[PDB]
């Protein structure tokens, strides 16, 4: 676990953590005190603040919500629904709809909640951005549907969408009220970096929830696996850095001006780094 990236936390996790229950209460994602507790025990506000150490107040609150939503939403597939691609999809589209236009009050609340997050997240960003981010969310959703075919390379290509790392990183951008020059986002390097960002969270998570999952995964596919599992992350991070260093050249290659280059650096540190690192701290 060589993550040469400094741990960070928004100096606002305070409030953020304390007021996290408000949003979900109103949107109706939490209908019971017991539920409230089960949520608080998740430490999602915490998480959000590790991913977005650079955001405070309102901004930070949105990240808390994304994190809260992520888990409330995931639970909806822990029963009979996560075994029927037709049933999950039925829900999937009711939420995904939000991306396109307004949702009928008839929509389930998990959908409404998402709608709210997506409104706030995308507003204030270049049109190109929302679209690109929506692109991601759809991929997120379809992932759950593919994932619903429960009824290495085999695994990653799929877990890479359900894992939800991208929508999270995108949020970093929104939360930090800035956008990486679009042309750089689609570079081979930035991609490989982002790919790594996913795999690592992907891998870590599968080692954290190993117990519960085998009690009913990446490790499976024992003492040997987890070993090189760690190795993999090590090498991945190693390369991540190797890549980071390439950024300057990249910035040249795409003729970035100052502002852009700045943006890039914020993306690098406040969006990518944090998503890889944040996961770790929290996971412990």
mmCIF file of C-alpha atoms in Angstrom:
data_model
loop_
_atom_site.group_PDB
_atom_site.id
_atom_site.type_symbol
_atom_site.label_atom_id
_atom_site.label_comp_id
_atom_site.label_asym_id
_atom_site.label_seq_id
_atom_site.Cartn_x
_atom_site.Cartn_y
_atom_site.Cartn_z
ATOM 1 C CA UNK A 1 0.000 0.000 0.000
ATOM 2 C CA UNK A 2 2.486 2.602 -1.220
ATOM 3 C CA UNK A 3 0.194 5.587 -1.809
ATOM 4 C CA UNK A 4 2.703 8.501 -2.029
ATOM 5 C CA UNK A 5 -0.241 10.808 -2.061
ATOM 6 C CA UNK A 6 -0.933 12.876 1.067
ATOM 7 C CA UNK A 7 -4.132 12.207 2.931
ATOM 8 C CA UNK A 8 -6.458 15.171 3.077
ATOM 9 C CA UNK A 9 -9.802 16.228 4.533
ATOM 10 C CA UNK A 10 -11.925 19.283 4.043
ATOM 11 C CA UNK A 11 -11.581 21.444 7.143
ATOM 12 C CA UNK A 12 -15.351 21.321 7.098
ATOM 13 C CA UNK A 13 -16.074 17.661 7.628
ATOM 14 C CA UNK A 14 -17.349 19.058 10.923
ATOM 15 C CA UNK A 15 -20.593 20.649 9.832
ATOM 16 C CA UNK A 16 -20.888 18.547 6.731
ATOM 17 C CA UNK A 17 -20.928 15.397 8.810
ATOM 18 C CA UNK A 18 -23.359 16.858 11.295
ATOM 19 C CA UNK A 19 -25.920 18.008 8.739
ATOM 20 C CA UNK A 20 -25.771 15.087 6.331
ATOM 21 C CA UNK A 21 -29.126 13.722 7.468
ATOM 22 C CA UNK A 22 -31.086 16.769 6.358
ATOM 23 C CA UNK A 23 -30.999 16.227 2.580
ATOM 24 C CA UNK A 24 -31.990 12.538 2.586
ATOM 25 C CA UNK A 25 -34.707 13.140 5.145
ATOM 26 C CA UNK A 26 -36.563 15.578 2.906
ATOM 27 C CA UNK A 27 -35.991 13.671 -0.327
ATOM 28 C CA UNK A 28 -37.484 10.710 1.498
ATOM 29 C CA UNK A 29 -34.515 8.336 1.149
ATOM 30 C CA UNK A 30 -34.601 7.875 4.945
ATOM 31 C CA UNK A 31 -37.993 7.185 6.508
ATOM 32 C CA UNK A 32 -36.786 5.838 9.890
ATOM 33 C CA UNK A 33 -34.584 6.750 12.852
ATOM 34 C CA UNK A 34 -33.059 3.263 12.649
ATOM 35 C CA UNK A 35 -32.334 4.033 9.017
ATOM 36 C CA UNK A 36 -30.834 7.366 10.064
ATOM 37 C CA UNK A 37 -28.391 5.545 12.346
ATOM 38 C CA UNK A 38 -27.506 2.891 9.835
ATOM 39 C CA UNK A 39 -26.666 5.732 7.509
ATOM 40 C CA UNK A 40 -24.644 7.727 10.011
ATOM 41 C CA UNK A 41 -22.643 4.610 10.776
ATOM 42 C CA UNK A 42 -21.664 4.596 7.141
ATOM 43 C CA UNK A 43 -19.515 7.665 7.628
ATOM 44 C CA UNK A 44 -20.394 8.899 4.188
ATOM 45 C CA UNK A 45 -19.966 12.565 5.041
ATOM 46 C CA UNK A 46 -16.501 11.626 6.148
ATOM 47 C CA UNK A 47 -15.820 9.906 2.872
ATOM 48 C CA UNK A 48 -17.029 12.812 0.802
ATOM 49 C CA UNK A 49 -14.697 15.083 2.747
ATOM 50 C CA UNK A 50 -11.686 12.883 1.931
ATOM 51 C CA UNK A 51 -12.522 12.919 -1.777
ATOM 52 C CA UNK A 52 -13.230 16.629 -1.759
ATOM 53 C CA UNK A 53 -10.890 18.119 0.860
ATOM 54 C CA UNK A 54 -10.894 21.219 -1.282
ATOM 55 C CA UNK A 55 -14.595 21.929 -0.944
ATOM 56 C CA UNK A 56 -16.444 23.593 1.898
ATOM 57 C CA UNK A 57 -20.047 24.406 2.798
ATOM 58 C CA UNK A 58 -22.609 24.033 0.055
ATOM 59 C CA UNK A 59 -20.136 22.425 -2.349
ATOM 60 C CA UNK A 60 -19.017 19.924 0.262
ATOM 61 C CA UNK A 61 -22.660 19.193 1.089
ATOM 62 C CA UNK A 62 -23.279 18.072 -2.480
ATOM 63 C CA UNK A 63 -20.396 15.629 -2.179
ATOM 64 C CA UNK A 64 -21.887 14.355 1.051
ATOM 65 C CA UNK A 65 -25.130 13.816 -0.826
ATOM 66 C CA UNK A 66 -23.458 12.033 -3.737
ATOM 67 C CA UNK A 67 -21.867 9.745 -1.210
ATOM 68 C CA UNK A 68 -25.096 9.339 0.725
ATOM 69 C CA UNK A 69 -27.013 8.679 -2.474
ATOM 70 C CA UNK A 70 -24.489 6.166 -3.666
ATOM 71 C CA UNK A 71 -25.162 3.853 -0.731
ATOM 72 C CA UNK A 72 -28.879 4.389 -0.348
ATOM 73 C CA UNK A 73 -29.099 3.558 -4.060
ATOM 74 C CA UNK A 74 -26.857 0.530 -3.855
ATOM 75 C CA UNK A 75 -28.973 -1.029 -1.106
ATOM 76 C CA UNK A 76 -31.872 -1.135 -3.535
ATOM 77 C CA UNK A 77 -30.050 -4.034 -5.246
ATOM 78 C CA UNK A 78 -29.107 -6.099 -2.203
ATOM 79 C CA UNK A 79 -32.216 -8.280 -2.416
ATOM 80 C CA UNK A 80 -34.202 -10.043 -5.201
ATOM 81 C CA UNK A 81 -33.795 -7.036 -7.558
ATOM 82 C CA UNK A 82 -30.038 -7.328 -7.905
ATOM 83 C CA UNK A 83 -30.582 -10.747 -9.414
ATOM 84 C CA UNK A 84 -33.004 -9.707 -12.193
ATOM 85 C CA UNK A 85 -31.538 -7.475 -14.992
ATOM 86 C CA UNK A 86 -35.095 -6.695 -16.052
ATOM 87 C CA UNK A 87 -36.067 -5.477 -12.565
ATOM 88 C CA UNK A 88 -32.962 -3.428 -11.844
ATOM 89 C CA UNK A 89 -33.151 -1.871 -15.310
ATOM 90 C CA UNK A 90 -36.774 -0.926 -14.548
ATOM 91 C CA UNK A 91 -35.475 1.192 -11.684
ATOM 92 C CA UNK A 92 -32.256 2.178 -13.448
ATOM 93 C CA UNK A 93 -34.094 4.112 -16.142
ATOM 94 C CA UNK A 94 -36.385 5.853 -13.713
ATOM 95 C CA UNK A 95 -33.292 7.414 -12.190
ATOM 96 C CA UNK A 96 -31.270 7.838 -15.361
ATOM 97 C CA UNK A 97 -34.264 9.709 -16.741
ATOM 98 C CA UNK A 98 -33.255 12.674 -14.591
ATOM 99 C CA UNK A 99 -30.317 13.219 -16.909
ATOM 100 C CA UNK A 100 -32.686 13.943 -19.814
ATOM 101 C CA UNK A 101 -35.462 16.029 -18.297
ATOM 102 C CA UNK A 102 -37.780 16.754 -15.310
ATOM 103 C CA UNK A 103 -39.128 13.713 -13.460
ATOM 104 C CA UNK A 104 -42.771 12.940 -12.693
ATOM 105 C CA UNK A 105 -43.558 13.305 -9.001
ATOM 106 C CA UNK A 106 -44.623 9.679 -9.412
ATOM 107 C CA UNK A 107 -40.945 8.791 -9.687
ATOM 108 C CA UNK A 108 -39.498 6.813 -6.785
ATOM 109 C CA UNK A 109 -37.604 8.949 -4.272
ATOM 110 C CA UNK A 110 -34.192 7.425 -5.061
ATOM 111 C CA UNK A 111 -34.789 8.957 -8.465
ATOM 112 C CA UNK A 112 -35.860 12.324 -7.125
ATOM 113 C CA UNK A 113 -32.823 12.377 -4.865
ATOM 114 C CA UNK A 114 -30.561 11.731 -7.816
ATOM 115 C CA UNK A 115 -32.375 14.359 -9.819
ATOM 116 C CA UNK A 116 -31.608 16.903 -7.094
ATOM 117 C CA UNK A 117 -27.952 15.976 -6.946
ATOM 118 C CA UNK A 118 -27.630 16.107 -10.719
ATOM 119 C CA UNK A 119 -29.304 19.500 -10.910
ATOM 120 C CA UNK A 120 -26.912 21.132 -8.495
ATOM 121 C CA UNK A 121 -23.917 19.209 -9.788
ATOM 122 C CA UNK A 122 -24.321 20.157 -13.411
ATOM 123 C CA UNK A 123 -25.435 23.766 -12.969
ATOM 124 C CA UNK A 124 -22.713 26.376 -13.372
ATOM 125 C CA UNK A 125 -20.683 24.070 -15.612
ATOM 126 C CA UNK A 126 -20.063 24.329 -19.353
ATOM 127 C CA UNK A 127 -22.794 22.556 -21.355
ATOM 128 C CA UNK A 128 -20.114 20.267 -22.770
ATOM 129 C CA UNK A 129 -19.336 19.217 -19.227
ATOM 130 C CA UNK A 130 -22.792 18.201 -18.095
ATOM 131 C CA UNK A 131 -23.169 16.132 -21.198
ATOM 132 C CA UNK A 132 -19.821 14.407 -20.622
ATOM 133 C CA UNK A 133 -20.675 13.813 -17.006
ATOM 134 C CA UNK A 134 -24.114 12.546 -17.936
ATOM 135 C CA UNK A 135 -22.256 10.222 -20.342
ATOM 136 C CA UNK A 136 -20.589 8.766 -17.226
ATOM 137 C CA UNK A 137 -23.737 8.404 -15.133
ATOM 138 C CA UNK A 138 -25.341 6.400 -17.919
ATOM 139 C CA UNK A 139 -22.335 4.184 -18.001
ATOM 140 C CA UNK A 140 -22.752 3.928 -14.223
ATOM 141 C CA UNK A 141 -26.334 2.834 -14.592
ATOM 142 C CA UNK A 142 -25.791 0.390 -17.424
ATOM 143 C CA UNK A 143 -23.076 -1.144 -15.286
ATOM 144 C CA UNK A 144 -25.619 -2.114 -12.633
ATOM 145 C CA UNK A 145 -27.716 -3.676 -15.342
ATOM 146 C CA UNK A 146 -24.817 -5.688 -16.745
ATOM 147 C CA UNK A 147 -23.715 -6.457 -13.184
ATOM 148 C CA UNK A 148 -27.242 -7.892 -12.768
ATOM 149 C CA UNK A 149 -26.185 -10.954 -14.785
ATOM 150 C CA UNK A 150 -25.363 -12.889 -11.654
ATOM 151 C CA UNK A 151 -28.149 -15.319 -12.526
ATOM 152 C CA UNK A 152 -9.532 -10.990 -13.568
ATOM 153 C CA UNK A 153 -9.975 -9.322 -16.950
ATOM 154 C CA UNK A 154 -13.320 -11.092 -16.744
ATOM 155 C CA UNK A 155 -14.127 -8.885 -13.774
ATOM 156 C CA UNK A 156 -12.570 -5.452 -14.215
ATOM 157 C CA UNK A 157 -14.285 -4.600 -17.495
ATOM 158 C CA UNK A 158 -17.558 -4.801 -15.551
ATOM 159 C CA UNK A 159 -16.755 -3.727 -12.005
ATOM 160 C CA UNK A 160 -15.258 -0.664 -13.635
ATOM 161 C CA UNK A 161 -18.694 0.863 -14.113
ATOM 162 C CA UNK A 162 -20.615 -0.246 -11.050
ATOM 163 C CA UNK A 163 -17.774 0.983 -8.850
ATOM 164 C CA UNK A 164 -18.873 4.570 -9.538
ATOM 165 C CA UNK A 165 -15.410 6.123 -9.351
ATOM 166 C CA UNK A 166 -15.900 8.377 -12.380
ATOM 167 C CA UNK A 167 -19.062 10.135 -11.267
ATOM 168 C CA UNK A 168 -17.210 10.764 -8.000
ATOM 169 C CA UNK A 169 -14.193 12.299 -9.697
ATOM 170 C CA UNK A 170 -16.454 14.385 -11.905
ATOM 171 C CA UNK A 171 -17.946 15.721 -8.707
ATOM 172 C CA UNK A 172 -14.492 16.859 -7.636
ATOM 173 C CA UNK A 173 -14.498 19.150 -10.641
ATOM 174 C CA UNK A 174 -17.950 20.568 -9.918
ATOM 175 C CA UNK A 175 -17.163 20.820 -6.217
ATOM 176 C CA UNK A 176 -13.995 22.725 -6.998
ATOM 177 C CA UNK A 177 -15.862 24.972 -9.478
ATOM 178 C CA UNK A 178 -13.378 24.230 -12.258
ATOM 179 C CA UNK A 179 -12.974 21.943 -15.205
ATOM 180 C CA UNK A 180 -9.918 20.240 -16.631
ATOM 181 C CA UNK A 181 -9.401 21.311 -20.236
ATOM 182 C CA UNK A 182 -11.657 18.932 -22.082
ATOM 183 C CA UNK A 183 -8.991 17.998 -24.659
ATOM 184 C CA UNK A 184 -6.714 16.765 -21.868
ATOM 185 C CA UNK A 185 -9.414 14.672 -20.238
ATOM 186 C CA UNK A 186 -9.506 12.472 -23.338
ATOM 187 C CA UNK A 187 -5.750 11.913 -23.508
ATOM 188 C CA UNK A 188 -4.267 8.444 -23.277
ATOM 189 C CA UNK A 189 -2.316 9.443 -20.180
ATOM 190 C CA UNK A 190 -5.172 11.028 -18.258
ATOM 191 C CA UNK A 191 -7.216 7.962 -19.145
ATOM 192 C CA UNK A 192 -4.657 5.481 -17.917
ATOM 193 C CA UNK A 193 -4.441 7.603 -14.789
ATOM 194 C CA UNK A 194 -8.180 7.522 -14.333
ATOM 195 C CA UNK A 195 -8.227 3.838 -15.151
ATOM 196 C CA UNK A 196 -5.729 3.281 -12.340
ATOM 197 C CA UNK A 197 -7.829 5.496 -10.077
ATOM 198 C CA UNK A 198 -10.672 3.058 -10.617
ATOM 199 C CA UNK A 199 -8.810 -0.239 -10.320
ATOM 200 C CA UNK A 200 -7.275 0.794 -7.016
ATOM 201 C CA UNK A 201 -10.595 1.766 -5.432
ATOM 202 C CA UNK A 202 -12.009 -1.279 -7.099
ATOM 203 C CA UNK A 203 -9.331 -3.523 -5.601
ATOM 204 C CA UNK A 204 -9.341 -1.976 -2.112
ATOM 205 C CA UNK A 205 -13.108 -2.219 -1.781
ATOM 206 C CA UNK A 206 -13.011 -5.920 -2.716
ATOM 207 C CA UNK A 207 -10.574 -6.504 0.111
ATOM 208 C CA UNK A 208 -12.568 -4.503 2.634
ATOM 209 C CA UNK A 209 -15.865 -6.267 1.914
ATOM 210 C CA UNK A 210 -14.150 -9.607 1.351
ATOM 211 C CA UNK A 211 -15.536 -11.098 4.562
ATOM 212 C CA UNK A 212 -19.196 -10.203 4.059
ATOM 213 C CA UNK A 213 -19.155 -11.243 0.369
ATOM 214 C CA UNK A 214 -17.542 -14.657 0.916
ATOM 215 C CA UNK A 215 -19.869 -15.011 3.902
ATOM 216 C CA UNK A 216 -22.679 -15.258 1.350
ATOM 217 C CA UNK A 217 -15.381 -10.758 -5.711
ATOM 218 C CA UNK A 218 -11.813 -9.975 -6.804
ATOM 219 C CA UNK A 219 -10.026 -12.071 -4.182
ATOM 220 C CA UNK A 220 -12.021 -15.208 -5.000
ATOM 221 C CA UNK A 221 -11.350 -15.354 -8.754
ATOM 222 C CA UNK A 222 -6.484 -17.315 -0.920
ATOM 223 C CA UNK A 223 -3.397 -16.026 0.947
ATOM 224 C CA UNK A 224 -1.559 -15.696 -2.377
ATOM 225 C CA UNK A 225 -4.195 -13.647 -4.192
ATOM 226 C CA UNK A 226 -4.465 -10.870 -1.585
ATOM 227 C CA UNK A 227 -0.682 -10.742 -1.760
ATOM 228 C CA UNK A 228 -0.295 -9.858 -5.424
ATOM 229 C CA UNK A 229 -3.574 -7.981 -4.930
ATOM 230 C CA UNK A 230 -1.459 -5.595 -2.868
ATOM 231 C CA UNK A 231 1.385 -5.789 -5.342
ATOM 232 C CA UNK A 232 -0.956 -4.747 -8.145
ATOM 233 C CA UNK A 233 -1.975 -1.593 -6.321
ATOM 234 C CA UNK A 234 1.666 -0.857 -5.555
ATOM 235 C CA UNK A 235 2.685 -1.128 -9.200
ATOM 236 C CA UNK A 236 -0.427 0.751 -10.258
ATOM 237 C CA UNK A 237 0.389 3.717 -8.021
ATOM 238 C CA UNK A 238 3.999 3.472 -9.094
ATOM 239 C CA UNK A 239 2.861 3.926 -12.677
ATOM 240 C CA UNK A 240 0.348 6.596 -11.700
ATOM 241 C CA UNK A 241 3.275 8.760 -10.637
ATOM 242 C CA UNK A 242 5.285 7.757 -13.666
ATOM 243 C CA UNK A 243 2.330 9.138 -15.595
ATOM 244 C CA UNK A 244 1.789 12.268 -13.521
ATOM 245 C CA UNK A 245 5.292 13.305 -14.473
ATOM 246 C CA UNK A 246 4.252 13.052 -18.108
ATOM 247 C CA UNK A 247 1.595 15.708 -17.587
ATOM 248 C CA UNK A 248 3.826 18.697 -18.390
ATOM 249 C CA UNK A 249 4.691 17.278 -21.807
ATOM 250 C CA UNK A 250 1.010 16.484 -22.205
ATOM 251 C CA UNK A 251 0.157 20.094 -21.388
ATOM 252 C CA UNK A 252 2.502 21.132 -24.157
ATOM 253 C CA UNK A 253 1.234 18.564 -26.630
ATOM 254 C CA UNK A 254 -2.265 20.035 -26.235
ATOM 255 C CA UNK A 255 -1.075 23.653 -26.123
ATOM 256 C CA UNK A 256 -2.599 24.469 -22.733
ATOM 257 C CA UNK A 257 -2.455 28.055 -21.584
ATOM 258 C CA UNK A 258 -1.869 29.057 -17.974
ATOM 259 C CA UNK A 259 -5.456 28.800 -16.716
ATOM 260 C CA UNK A 260 -5.904 25.450 -18.408
ATOM 261 C CA UNK A 261 -2.646 24.104 -17.032
ATOM 262 C CA UNK A 262 -3.811 25.290 -13.629
ATOM 263 C CA UNK A 263 -7.110 23.488 -14.054
ATOM 264 C CA UNK A 264 -5.233 20.378 -15.035
ATOM 265 C CA UNK A 265 -3.161 20.542 -11.869
ATOM 266 C CA UNK A 266 -6.257 20.978 -9.711
ATOM 267 C CA UNK A 267 -7.825 18.030 -11.431
ATOM 268 C CA UNK A 268 -4.663 16.085 -10.785
ATOM 269 C CA UNK A 269 -4.492 16.929 -7.109
ATOM 270 C CA UNK A 270 -8.026 17.788 -5.998
ATOM 271 C CA UNK A 271 -9.874 15.238 -8.189
ATOM 272 C CA UNK A 272 -7.713 12.302 -9.181
ATOM 273 C CA UNK A 273 -5.249 12.096 -6.310
ATOM 274 C CA UNK A 274 -8.005 12.527 -3.772
ATOM 275 C CA UNK A 275 -10.172 9.784 -5.258
ATOM 276 C CA UNK A 276 -7.339 7.299 -5.083
ATOM 277 C CA UNK A 277 -6.112 8.447 -1.695
ATOM 278 C CA UNK A 278 -9.427 9.333 -0.118
ATOM 279 C CA UNK A 279 -10.670 5.806 -0.677
ATOM 280 C CA UNK A 280 -7.711 4.436 1.279
ATOM 281 C CA UNK A 281 -7.815 6.647 4.388
ATOM 282 C CA UNK A 282 -11.545 6.091 4.763
ATOM 283 C CA UNK A 283 -11.304 2.351 4.008
ATOM 284 C CA UNK A 284 -9.233 2.132 7.215
#
